[PDB]
Design a protein around this ligand. Structure first.
Ligand SMILES: CCCCCCCC/C=C\CCCCCCCC(=O)OC[C@H](O)CO
Ligand SMILES: CCCCCCCC/C=C\CCCCCCCC(=O)OC[C@H](O)CO
Ligand SMILES: *C/C=C(C)/C=C/C=C(C)/C=C/C1=C(C)CCCC1(C)C
Ligand SMILES: CCCCCCCCCCCCCCCCCCCC
Ligand SMILES: CCCCCCCCCCCCCCCCCCCC
Ligand SMILES: CCCCCCCCCCCCCCCCCCCC
Ligand SMILES: CCCCCCCCCCCCCCCCCCCC
Ligand SMILES: CCCCCCCCCCCCCCCCCCCC
Ligand SMILES: CCCCCCCCCCCCCCCCCCCC
Ligand SMILES: CCCCCCCCCCCCCCCCCCCC
Ligand SMILES: CCCCCCCCCCCCCCCCCCCC
Length: 217
């Protein structure tokens, strides 16, 4: 439904802003040396807040720009890896992973955009899919490895961060392939919007929880 897609854009706008202000307000409840991930988490929700306002306006206007979603992803998806690295690493090791995982995440979204902006089932579509899927798997394997050697409450807090991404991000590549299986355009927009709220606000809340554990909570 077209009115549903629009209503969900408005629910996402409000959920993203609620997440932004929750995370900024909660940042003071954790120690300064563990705040970086909470701040980056709030920034991700704030960018998505701005983009969901623009998507809702674009939609109601009758000129829905499918590119707004990818501008949001190319910014927020690398930052989401960064907000996780901000609680698992510091110093040189953090900067190294921010560069390496951040570039990988940008390539994944860029390959997706290359494929999305072609005829469905076209060669460009499949090139995009394979390069983005390969980078996705590479990132999910890096995330699995990031947990190795963690202990006690930090191992449990990291498991939750890792599994939100592992389970919660499957919908994105699933949605991409859907249109070659049939007509799933309207449902894909709805499911991506719900997924974005859960993934972005949920990951920020779990990064906050890791930062609380690390602060001695
Ligand atoms: C490289 C990643 C490409 C991001 C997609 C993009 O920039 O899309 C522009 C769109 O037309 C603007 O709404
Ligand atoms: C190191 C782990 C990274 C391994 C990356 C594995 C790549 C998998 C892949 O190529 O996915 C393409 C997709 O299945 C299209 O059929
Ligand atoms: C806040 C938004 C998020 C976390 C969006 C995540 C999006 C992806 C993981 C997209 C992945 C894709 C592939 C793995 C292959 C097909 C192309 C994409 C870009 C849909
Ligand atoms: C409408 C979507 C609601 C999600 C935003 C919730 C704001 C964060 C509060 C989480 C509590 C932990
Ligand atoms: C127009 C785009 C909307 C952006 C809204 C920003 C919401 C506020 C979040 C600010 C967080 C600052 C970034 C912190 C970086 C961490 C470094 C330590
Ligand atoms: C066209 C706008 C996209 C530019 C790509 C910049 C990479 C984002 C990393 C943060
Ligand atoms: C390529 C991804 C770069 C992310 C920029 C933000 C880094 C925050 C530094 C702490
Ligand atoms: C509509 C598609 C969105 C599906 C989201 C996947 C569900 C979230 C996965 C939860 C994993 C971590 C749970 C932590 C709870 C504390
Ligand atoms: C047919 C169009 C209706 C689409 C509704 C999608 C509902 C998905 C909800 C997933 C979990 C609930 C939170
Ligand atoms: C449907 C909500 C599931 C999303 C999981 C996010 C983690 C909640 C943190 C407490
Ligand atoms: C569809 C809206 C679901 C909101 C989930 C976001 C994470 C909840 C935080 C606890």
């Amino acid at each position: 439904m077209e009115e549903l897609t629009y209503r969900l854009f408005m629910v996402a706008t409000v959920g993203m802003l609620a997440g932004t202000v929750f995370l900024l307000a909660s940042s003071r409840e954790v120690k300064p040396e563990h705040r970086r991930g909470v701040y980056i988490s709030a920034l991700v929700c704030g960018i998505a807040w701005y983009h969901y306002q623009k998507m809702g306006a674009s939609w109601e206007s009758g000129s829905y720009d499918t590119g707004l979603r990818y501008v949001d992803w190319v910014l927020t998806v690398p930052l989401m890896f960064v907000e996780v690295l901000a609680v698992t690493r510091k110093g040189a090791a953090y900067n190294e992973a921010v560069r390496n995982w951040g570039i990988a995440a940008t390539v994944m979204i860029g390959a997706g955009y290359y494929g999305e902006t072609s005829a469905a089932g076209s060669n460009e579509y499949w090139t995009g899919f394979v390069i983005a899927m390969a980078t996705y798997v590479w990132l999910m394997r890096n995330l699995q490895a990031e947990g190795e050697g963690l202990k006690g409450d930090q191992a449990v807090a990291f498991e939750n961060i890792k599994n939100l991404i592992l389970v919660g991000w499957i919908i994105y590549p699933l949605g991409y392939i859907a249109p070659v299986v049939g007509d799933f355009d309207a449902i894909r927009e709805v499911l991506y919007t719900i997924a974005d709220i859960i993934n972005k606000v949920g990951l920020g809340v779990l990064v906050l929880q890791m930062a609380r554990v690390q602060s001695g909570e």
